[PDB]
């Protein structure tokens, strides 16, 4: 009848421990993000930090290179492996094929390794996913995703966690050419779509903007307040 | 039915059903009747396809010059042993520079399928191969089964509805050791067509025929090559 799932497929043609694993991404740390013709932005929050503990230890999002950055969700245990495992391959794509790392190459490695990660009885599957954030050579944007089955897909913006389709409905108005024409309105639009995600209290909010090929910098609680002021002024002048 | 899971574990009655389960896959394949005379041998098989526009998949193929074979059941183990048959046929064809008779050659195939039917974590192999060949003493027809038991015969048949073939074979197989090739081929299809339902063809592209001899190299007969064998046929009665 029903053996649940180990490796071999279930009678319905699908699996279980895979479908069971995607719910961990739903209960994991939420994240958002957007892209533009030059500058790109992202966000995570969901830190649950009380400030009484070390802030650098809870830091998760990192970057393999200034051009391509890593953004993941869920637990950071297996994600810390995804970091180091991709750092060795991105350094091999550094080493071999000296050109800047292409998103197709690096994503297939993690995907091909994420397929054998879920295969043997043997290597434990991933219960988490990740979304690559960066820019193509000559300023073109690139953002992709990952799947527990070891597949990759590209999006126009990063919406995951709770309410993936609800934020995607708000991303329909984000398809306009005005976003991002100026980096001041884009960050204000990031705090907009993020306002409907979780608490959005401004404390745990962490956003890093990458302009063209320049390495991104995490916004300190200085410019974030100014971009929140123009977002509140645009909301007050909208009536 | 839990005692039939492991091939290593013997049943309460000692009969392992994992071989009998693969016997079904051998008997779920197409109806094929092989036979041999003293002069030459004629082996026959059947083709079936998914749809009408889909070409009927062939079964009988050629391996050694003097060894023709048929096939039924799983194609995975078929082409695995087929390429394994190539390596075994080229063993003596290279080092000894002579072809291997079917007698001592299948003894290695029976041992190749012994390990998967013995050790734990392995499964038997359903195989519908009907092996032919000519050594100095004339033709030999063996059989392949998941039980890894090959018997030298003049005529044998496996697959679906093949129990009705043996009945037509018994008196005919003793009388088929004499006549030459041509009339033996059309008498071979006069068997399968009685086994198969009599209300439908039996076309040119759904049947497999092959002929091998001591001085005659094995040639695959399919599609237009079957037309000389299907001409001058006696229709089935009602």
């Amino acid at each position: 009848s029903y053996d649940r799932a180990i490796t071999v497929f279930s009678p319905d043609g699908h699996l279980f421990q895979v479908e069971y694993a995607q719910e961990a991404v739903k209960k994991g740390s939420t994240a958002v993000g957007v892209r533009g013709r030059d500058i790109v932005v992202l966000g995570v929050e969901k830190k649950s930090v009380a400030k009484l503990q070390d802030e650098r230890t809870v830091r998760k999002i990192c970057a393999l290179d200034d051009n391509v950055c890593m953004a993941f969700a869920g637990l950071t245990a297996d994600a810390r492996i995804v970091i180091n495992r991709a750092r060795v391959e991105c350094q091999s794509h550094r080493l071999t094929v000296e050109d800047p790392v292409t998103v197709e190459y690096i994503t297939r490695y993690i995907a091909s390794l994420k397929q054998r990660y879920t295969q043997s009885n043997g290597r434990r599957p991933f219960g988490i996913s990740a979304l690559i954030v960066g820019f193509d050579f000559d300023g073109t944007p690139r953002l992709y995703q990952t799947d527990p089955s070891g597949t990759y897909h590209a999006w126009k913006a990063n919406a995951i966690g709770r309410g993936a389709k609800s934020v995607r409905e708000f991303l329909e108005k984000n398809y306009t050419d005005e976003a991002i024409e100026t980096d001041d309105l884009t960050i204000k639009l990031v705090i907009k779509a993020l306002l409907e995600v979780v608490q959005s209290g401004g404390k745990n909010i962490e956003l890093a903007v990458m302009r063209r090929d320049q390495s991104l910098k995490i916004l300190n609680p200085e410019e974030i307040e100014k971009y929140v002021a123009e977002i509140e002024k645009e909301k007050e002048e909208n009536e | 039915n839990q005692y039939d899971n492991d091939v290593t574990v013997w049943s309460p009655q000692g009969r392992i059903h994992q071989i009998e389960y693969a016997m079904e896959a051998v008997k779920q394949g197409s109806a094929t009747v092989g036979l041999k005379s003293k002069t030459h041998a004629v082996l026959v098989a059947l083709k079936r396809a998914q749809s009408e526009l889909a070409a009927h998949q062939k079964k009988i193929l050629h391996v050694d010059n003097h060894i023709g074979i048929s096939i039924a059941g799983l194609t995975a183990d078929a082409r695995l042993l087929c390429n394994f048959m190539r390596q075994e046929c080229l063993d003596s064809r290279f080092v000894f520079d002579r072809p291997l008779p079917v007698s001592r050659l299948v003894s290695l195939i029976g041992s190749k399928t012994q390990i998967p039917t013995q050790r734990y974590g392995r499964r038997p192999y359903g195989v519908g191969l009907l092996i032919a060949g000519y050594d100095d003493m004339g033709p030999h027809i063996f059989q392949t089964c998941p039980s890894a038991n090959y018997f030298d015969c003049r005529a044998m048949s496996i697959g679906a509805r093949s129990q009705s073939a043996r009945t037509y074979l018994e008196r005919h197989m003793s009388e088929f050791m004499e006549c030459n090739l041509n009339e033996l081929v059309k008498h071979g299809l006069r068997a399968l067509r009685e086994t198969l339902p009599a209300e439908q063809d039996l076309t040119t592209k759904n049947v497999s025929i092959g002929i091998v001899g001591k001085d005659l190299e094995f040639t695959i007969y399919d599609d237009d090559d079957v037309s000389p064998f299907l001409e001058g046929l006696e229709e089935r009665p009602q």
């Binding site: - | 779920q28 394949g29 079936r48 998914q50 799983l74 194609t75 995975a76 129990q163 009945t167």
Partner: protein
């Protein structure tokens, strides 16, 4: 008698059957009025049943022979009117492993062929029809597989 207890729903009778063994043990008059018993399967059989008063002759009835399946089905079909030219050779060989009740299933089927029926049975294919009905027919064979 199963293994452990309690309890079986028929345990009152499984004690009474063993009481019958006691009646065939201690009661001499039970040697009179022979009683006949029949079972579907010997999977559960009491070892204490061995005796002349208890079960003595025990016969294992296998699947009837191909000639036996033809004789039992001919006695049942002697009343019906069947189309002529019955060789009895093919219908006997086409019967293998089939139970006597499945033979009457073909016999009861063979009684419907008179009028129309309306499907065309013609002749000599009648027996092999309901013979394959239970365990056959493909269909598959190959499709979805190799």
């Amino acid at each position: 008698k199963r293994f452990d207890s309690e309890k079986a729903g028929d345990r009152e009778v499984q004690r009474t059957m063993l009481e019958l063994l006691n009646q065939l043990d201690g009661f001499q008059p039970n040697t009179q009025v022979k009683v006949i018993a029949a079972t579907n399967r010997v999977d559960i059989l009491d070892p204490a049943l061995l005796r002349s008063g208890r079960l003595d002759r025990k016969i294992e009835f296998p699947m009837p022979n191909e000639e036996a399946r033809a004789r039992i089905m001919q006695i049942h079909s002697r009343k019906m009117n069947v189309s002529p030219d019955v060789n009895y050779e093919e219908l006997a060989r086409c019967t293998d492993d089939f139970n006597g009740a499945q033979c009457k299933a073909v016999c009861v089927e063979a009684g419907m062929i008179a009028l129309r029926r309306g499907a065309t049975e013609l002749t000599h294919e009648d027996y092999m029809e309901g013979i394959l009905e239970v365990q056959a027919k493909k269909k598959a064979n190959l499709q979805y597989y190799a």
